[PDB]
Amino acid sequence: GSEVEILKALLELKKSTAELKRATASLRAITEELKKNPSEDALVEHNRAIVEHNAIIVENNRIIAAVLMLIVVAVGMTQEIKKALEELVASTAELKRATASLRAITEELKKNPSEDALVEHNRAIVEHNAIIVENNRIIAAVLELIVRALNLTDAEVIKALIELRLSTLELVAATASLREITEELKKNPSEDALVEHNRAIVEHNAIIVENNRIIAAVLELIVG
Amino acid sequence: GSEVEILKALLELKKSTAELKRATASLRAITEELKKNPSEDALVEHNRAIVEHNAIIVENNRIIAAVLMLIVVAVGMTQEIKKALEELVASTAELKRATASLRAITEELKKNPSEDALVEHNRAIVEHNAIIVENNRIIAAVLELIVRALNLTDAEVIKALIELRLSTLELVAATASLREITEELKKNPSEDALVEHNRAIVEHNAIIVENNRIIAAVLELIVG
Amino acid sequence: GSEVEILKALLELKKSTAELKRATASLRAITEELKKNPSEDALVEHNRAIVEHNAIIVENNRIIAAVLMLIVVAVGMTQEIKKALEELVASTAELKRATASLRAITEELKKNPSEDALVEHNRAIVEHNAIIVENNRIIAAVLELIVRALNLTDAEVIKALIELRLSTLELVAATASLREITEELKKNPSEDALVEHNRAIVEHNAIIVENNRIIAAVLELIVG
Amino acid sequence: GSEVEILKALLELKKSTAELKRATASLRAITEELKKNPSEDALVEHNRAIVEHNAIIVENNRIIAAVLMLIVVAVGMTQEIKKALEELVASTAELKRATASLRAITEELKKNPSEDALVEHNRAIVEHNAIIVENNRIIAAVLELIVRALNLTDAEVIKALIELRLSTLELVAATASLREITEELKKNPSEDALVEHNRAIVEHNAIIVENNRIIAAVLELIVG
């Protein structure tokens, strides 16, 4: 793909440079030879027009190449985006499996409220949060790939990406804390440990909500 | 390149759709089963949070896919752009050759102002204008490819492209008229035919200037 | 066709320009000669009226040429449209043949439900979808030709065309995926492969429906 | 040009009609044969999707042909427009010659105010008005050609054209009256005849101004 397109852009720069050098040489040959006898009006006026036309063409070639380099840089990220998508697809499928599992657990817990079903409920919630964390990590990575691929410079998007990175650090640390709390609850289940675990979950969900808010802000800036 | 990236985007849409269907099924199973006994607070609150998280993830996947499709469409034009560049490079090289030829003719005409050298001058000028016309046709084509590749909707760029197309029609018709006038001058050279030819050249150059102005306006709109 | 009409428009521009230059020259000759003796009222008032009349005529010629250039640009696409129509006609005829084949297969399959008839049914469905994809590609191309020929600038039509291009990319990728799934079913037919294939068909039809919706929106915008 | 494009549109209508007939035949064969055994779900659902796809394609072909017929009708007027332009160009050139003649007369009359120069002045003014009348007749004709070529239905443009036709009748009658007055002045020149002639000129110019106002209104409606 871009391996050849870029080689052609380089060939274009070489040819427009050679054109510029030759057009400049005629510019000067014209001034020096025609000033000798201004009565040769057609020759000097035609050659000056030729020089202006070439100068414009060279400037246009420079601008066109400058734009195509942006298309080329977007093209060169095809494999990075493809891999980010493969990860996002696997994450989505895992999230779906966790949701179906949780639904089945909910039905079993309500129909037959065995303590084991409550344990399975909390386990499913922890798996779901781990999946959300992986999903948001993958999305943040794909957002960075999109921002880079589109060559965005908007200060608002850069700041939003910084906020996203910080919120993903907070989300990962909170996730690790939630997993440790769940394991401690499992080892020594109790009413106090269970209420502390439920509080840890509420705080974790609040963090996820903030992370999703930031992701939404980044997407809004990219789309709009 | 885009052949696989797009297949992955379609796979993502399939998976986010399956996730949405499953998240919806749990949304309803939760509401209907939990209203039976609101005292199971942890189960209903955790599952509602789960549903909100999935709904957000599905919406984000939709938006991300929508953006990546714009990158994919830009990527899919790689071969069209490569061919447009090959044409532009060949045109640039031909323009350079015409310029070098004209410079050599100018030097020969000034050093030895034979009538044959004036004839060669007018021939070189006509070849140069034919080259500009081919060059601007190629640039207009690459500009359309750029506008399509970047998915631009700005009304100003669309109008500028329309003006460009019209000016390229005017330029081609004027070029054909100039070639016919040159052939008539060559067949029956005279002072009156020569002055009419020089006027034809001035009008042609004015048309080229307008065509380049429009191209510059289009590039300004694309870059800025 | 347009080759001569445009040459005439250029001749008109040349003549209205010469008229403008001469009308301006009399404008000034009038001011300078008549201010010498304002008592020559009839001469100055008549010549001023003459100048205003010419200025109006020059402006009208400019506007008329500007409109006719839009008619000329629409005319110049005659061969591109003719070729797009030839493709659309061939596509329509092929779609008809596929439909008649499918009808005959349906009758044979219901009258004698041999497994081979089911295989032929799925083959006919795949051919039909391939035909729809070619038909919609051709229509999208003719829509672009119509939009360009009519010099439309409506932001809504430009956006609809962008959506169309993206949906045609999705449609082509889905079609390739459907063909591959059908080939895999043919090589290893089974109940699970057959149900997966039928699901692939349902998803493909949903994509076709969306592509047709976008095409309909574009046609609505062109007609209305 | 349009001779072939229109034949292709007719071929398209023939082929889309045949498609419609076959799609309808399968629609009915499907309903009647499948109701015999609704358990053949894949066959009935696939064929119903096939029928919907064909119905949509047929409606789209009808709409596309309806638009292309408007392009074809615009194309078919190429020779009428070309001839209107040839007339407008000849009119412009004649107007330029009259203007240059009037300028030379003005210079001669001011430099050497011979009675013969005043006679030539009034003659040149009458010729100029005759030229304006021919120019506006030609413009009104080209406006009618443009309105027909663009298939405009706007009530405002139709009314403006009616007003134009009426004003051109007034302009022609006034022109004939001015010519008769000029001939009477020439045969029996006098101060009273000269002042009556000058009044006739003022009234004629007022009529020309109104005719140009209407033409401008028509152009405004066509462009906007």
Author numbering:
A (entry chain C), B (entry chain E), C (entry chain Z), D (entry chain L): 1 to 224
Could you give the paper's own sentences about this structure?
Here we describe the de novo design of pH-responsive protein filaments built from subunits containing six or nine buried histidine residues that assemble into micrometre-scale, well-ordered fibres at neutral pH. We then applied the filament design method described in Shen et al. to dock these connected monomers into a wide variety of helical filament arrangements and design the amino acid residues at the newly formed interfaces to drive assembly.
All 18 designs were well expressed and soluble. Two designs (DpHF7 and DpHF18) were found to form filaments, as seen in negative stain electron microscopy (EM) images. The resulting overall architecture can be viewed as a right-handed helix composed of two identical, parallel strands with contacting subunits. The pH transition is thus reversible, and the pH transition midpoint can be increased by increasing the number of buried histidines.
